[PDB]
Amino acid sequence: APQTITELCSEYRNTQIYTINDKILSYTESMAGKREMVIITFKSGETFQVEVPGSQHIDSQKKAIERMKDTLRITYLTETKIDKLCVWNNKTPNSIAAISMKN
Amino acid sequence: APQTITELCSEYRNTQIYTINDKILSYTESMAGKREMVIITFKSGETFQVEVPGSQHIDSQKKAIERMKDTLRITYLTETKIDKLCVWNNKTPNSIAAISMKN
Amino acid sequence: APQTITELCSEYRNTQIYTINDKILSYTESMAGKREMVIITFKSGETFQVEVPGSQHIDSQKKAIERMKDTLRITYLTETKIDKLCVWNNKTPNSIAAISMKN
Amino acid sequence: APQTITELCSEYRNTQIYTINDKILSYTESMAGKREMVIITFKSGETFQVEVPGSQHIDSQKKAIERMKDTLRITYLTETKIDKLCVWNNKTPNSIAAISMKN
Amino acid sequence: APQTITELCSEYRNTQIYTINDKILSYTESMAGKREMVIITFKSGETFQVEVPGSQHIDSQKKAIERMKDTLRITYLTETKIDKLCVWNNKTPNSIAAISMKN
């Protein structure tokens, strides 16, 4: 299995690593129909989302999608620094695939 | 693919954005039959609710409803400031569709 | 929908509002068969339970019961002040229907 | 329903109350097959387990078993004092049936 | 039932105990398809994973896997020191079977 977020991210197409080294600036969570999602921003101006489950997701990802939202909420509340984000860049805002936190 | 809560809020009918910029004053949680909901208030005087799951909610929203209630609780306990709320105004009290937090 | 715990409590038969305005003194949790419940007490000596799910509960209450237990545990751990409790008084200890927390 | 852990505990076969009045010393969590359990110890030398779900547990206990594990982990992480433990003593280590906390 | 992580670890083949006595340095979480896993590292250079659920896992382990990921996240966020780890060493990075922490 991969050992780093960078190694993991490269196993996929349409992904990009973003070096954030910062805490989340804003957290947005929606339960509005068809938009059950979370959007996070950074002081840097970059915006990312955890996508609404859909056709392209494999079953195994459903639980992971819920976990990611859980992680982003607590990471935001605790003002924890995010190291890197592996994101799918064929979505707008970019879609979070993986996250890493250091220290 | 909204980038902000206001943009997200505009995709729905009967919604409005409330700029709160404050922590939740009261948190009320009910497990009474047909009243399984959460109600929050702000010192401003606004009261909002996370509705009881009903026939108007699609299947994707069920988990989102539970997530929102989780978010409101932890947000209240941590005295975290809420920035904006996207709410449905055809309900009394207004029903939360999305929340955003900043700082 | 109700806007306050008092308004909400008044919608049911066999309920009464207890003004606590204090943190929980003790938290008891049981996983013993047929006694899967939580019991909380206050300095005042007042004691309350979240009932074991039974035939009197409607399906929609099942997840609300679990949420209420989650809520009591975290408010206990955080020393959070409980404002009022809406409880059914035809059970001993009185059974928690709704809880409100405020400044 | 019982009003205290002592009363609750007395309702079962093969159980005894342990007055611990101390925070958990060590927390062990296993996800190894047929050993998905939690083990906790105290300075006094007492060791207790939350049993792996088994053929002796009724359905309603399944959710309670998972809750108990959640409770022990957060109690450990928060250095919260455990008041008493009601345990089944026909198991080694003794199996947790209920726990109470005060302070 | 085993009484210590060391005893529990011994019951398995291809396992090994790691004495860490340190907080997690970094936490990486992935929801990328087929890589829904968590990777943690320590200052020492040790890297461990919570494997993606697969054909090697039995019924009861599925919930335990999710629990372990929850634990690692909260342990990381709280900078809680990890004492020992029981890992399967026929995986790269080594796969976590059990974790123990002492306060």
Ligand SMILES: OC[C@H]1O[C@@H](S[C@@H]2O[C@H](CO)[C@H](O)[C@H](O)[C@H]2O)[C@H](O)[C@@H](O)[C@H]1O
């Ligand atoms: O990553 C391999 C899988 O790709 C998706 S399509 C892909 O899905 C991710 C979320 O997993 C993002 O939404 C990307 O934006 C989107 O392009 C396929 O449907 C799967 O079959 C795999 O090929």
Ligand SMILES: OC[C@H]1O[C@@H](S[C@@H]2O[C@H](CO)[C@H](O)[C@H](O)[C@H]2O)[C@H](O)[C@@H](O)[C@H]1O
């Ligand atoms: O928002 C589009 C959907 O509207 C609901 S009705 C709508 O439901 C929300 C919660 O999703 C709030 O309760 C509002 O008060 C209520 O008006 C429809 O039933 C769906 O078919 C969509 O049209």
Ligand SMILES: OC[C@H]1O[C@@H](S[C@@H]2O[C@H](CO)[C@H](O)[C@H](O)[C@H]2O)[C@H](O)[C@@H](O)[C@H]1O
């Ligand atoms: O509250 C209306 C419902 O009353 C219950 S009986 C009631 O149930 C609550 C929990 O909802 C407590 O256990 C009370 O002690 C108990 O009396 C009915 O079963 C429902 O049909 C509603 O009528």
Ligand SMILES: OC[C@H]1O[C@@H](S[C@@H]2O[C@H](CO)[C@H](O)[C@H](O)[C@H]2O)[C@H](O)[C@@H](O)[C@H]1O
């Ligand atoms: O407690 C009454 C029930 O006892 C179990 S056997 C009992 O189960 C608990 C967990 O509920 C512990 O594992 C004890 O060590 C074990 O002896 C029966 O199977 C049920 O029939 C009830 O009688």
Ligand SMILES: OC[C@H]1O[C@@H](S[C@@H]2O[C@H](CO)[C@H](O)[C@H](O)[C@H]2O)[C@H](O)[C@@H](O)[C@H]1O
């Ligand atoms: O541990 C006994 C079982 O071993 C697995 S194979 C074993 O699985 C663990 C997770 O349970 C790790 O992935 C190890 O790397 C892997 O080798 C068998 O499939 C089961 O039948 C038991 O024999």
